[PDB]
Amino acid sequence: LSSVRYGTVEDLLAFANHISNTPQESGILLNMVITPQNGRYQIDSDVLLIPWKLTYRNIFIPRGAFGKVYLAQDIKTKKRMACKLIPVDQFKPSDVEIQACFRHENIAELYGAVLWGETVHLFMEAGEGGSVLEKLESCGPMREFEIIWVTKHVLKGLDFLHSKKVIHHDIKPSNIVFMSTKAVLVDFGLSVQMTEDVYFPKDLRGTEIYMSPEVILCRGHSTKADIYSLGATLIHMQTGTPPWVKRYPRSAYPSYLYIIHKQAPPLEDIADDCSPGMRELIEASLERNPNHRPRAADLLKHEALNP
């Protein structure tokens, strides 16, 4: 492959595998929202990298697990897209594999992948309203109805991913983005496709604050790891502050691995203003034993998220 062209999921998958296994830009486009010109797709000529514009008064380039995310606009279609820039050395095929093989309203769509220099450019569905993190950072704690609305979208995305034996591995406010009529899950760089009922980790993956005790242990875990991460995300949304941060601030020792392993679940971090329904939902999400922890499908049936 020496040019940028429209192709199949298989073409994209073969292209992504060739990068991770080491002149003019090359790549595979899955959607006609991106317009190649004579097999080219150049920055400042066929696509413009425009600034993200958040509407908050109180408070930008978000950082993913393996690269920064920019706002891009196709010059021909005028389609706004997220463009994640990943150095080839840091490129994991899962950053394209999940979004290319699986399609759901609550999972960010992949438009195309372009290699130029030593950088992989991932064109995706844009969450122009920013992420849950920016909302929390500028407005403080989220109202219950906002938490319910977001949780429902996240839970439909997780229910779908888990049905397909996919562990996201990094469920947190910055990976849940606002779109005009929905909230969507982003960043599949740390995601894994399970082949057995238990996944045995090679390394320690995720954001420590939202990390389950079984992930910290490295003795094997499953999709239930994402359910706990959601519970930790729910505490951050309800209180405006991530769990562990108020009780155990980090200074000399930045690691939370010991605290979380000895003291999880962080039930003490649920605010007093929390409703009985919401409290029950957060408490079940954070269950220490993953076997006793509910599935995303089970959480969708909860009273707190239904009329």
Q: Which residues bind ligand 499 (CB under 6 A)?
A: 52, 54, 60, 62, 64, 69, 82, 84, 108, 124-127, 130-131, 134, 174, 177, 186-187
Q: How far is the CB of 65 from ligand 499 (least distance, A)?
A: 7
Q: How far is the CB of 67 from ligand 499 (least distance, A)?
A: 8
64 is in an annotated binding site: yes
- Smaller CB distance to ligand 499: residue 132 or 260? 132
CB burial class (10 A; 0-12, 13-18, 19+) of residue 107? buried
295 is in an annotated binding site: no
Q: How far is the CB of 104 from ligand 499 (least distance, A)?
A: 14
Buried b (16+ CB within 10 A) or exposed e, 123-138: bbbbbeebbbbbbbee
- Smaller CB distance to ligand 499: residue 30 or 278? 30
33 is in an annotated binding site: no
84 is in an annotated binding site: yes
Q: How far is the CB of 42 from ligand 499 (least distance, A)?
A: 21
Contacts 24+ apart (CB under 8 A), 96-100: 96/12, 96/13, 96/16, 96/122, 96/188, 97/13, 97/16, 97/188, 97/193, 98/161, 98/166, 98/188, 98/191, 98/193, 99/124, 99/188, 100/9, 100/12, 100/13, 100/30
Out of 170, 187, 226, 269, the active site residue is: 170
Please tell me what DSSP assigns to residue 57: S
Buried b (16+ CB within 10 A) or exposed e, 51-80: ebeeeeeeeeebebbbbebbbbebeeeebe
Please tell me what DSSP assigns to residue 305: G
Q: Where are the alpha helices (DSSP H) in the chain?
A: 9-20, 94-101, 132-139, 144-163, 213-217, 224-239, 257-263, 276-285, 296-299
- Smaller CB distance to ligand 499: residue 63 or 288? 63
Contact between 305 and 281 under an 8 Å Cβ cutoff? The reply is yes
State which residue has the least CB distance to ligand 499.
64
- Smaller CB distance to ligand 499: residue 88 or 271? 88
170 is catalytic: yes
198 is in an annotated binding site: no
- Smaller CB distance to ligand 499: residue 84 or 293? 84
Q: How far is the CB of 219 from ligand 499 (least distance, A)?
A: 28
Query: Could you list the active site residues?
Result: 170
- Binding site, annotated residues: 61-69, 84
- Binding site, annotated residues for ATP: 61-69, 84
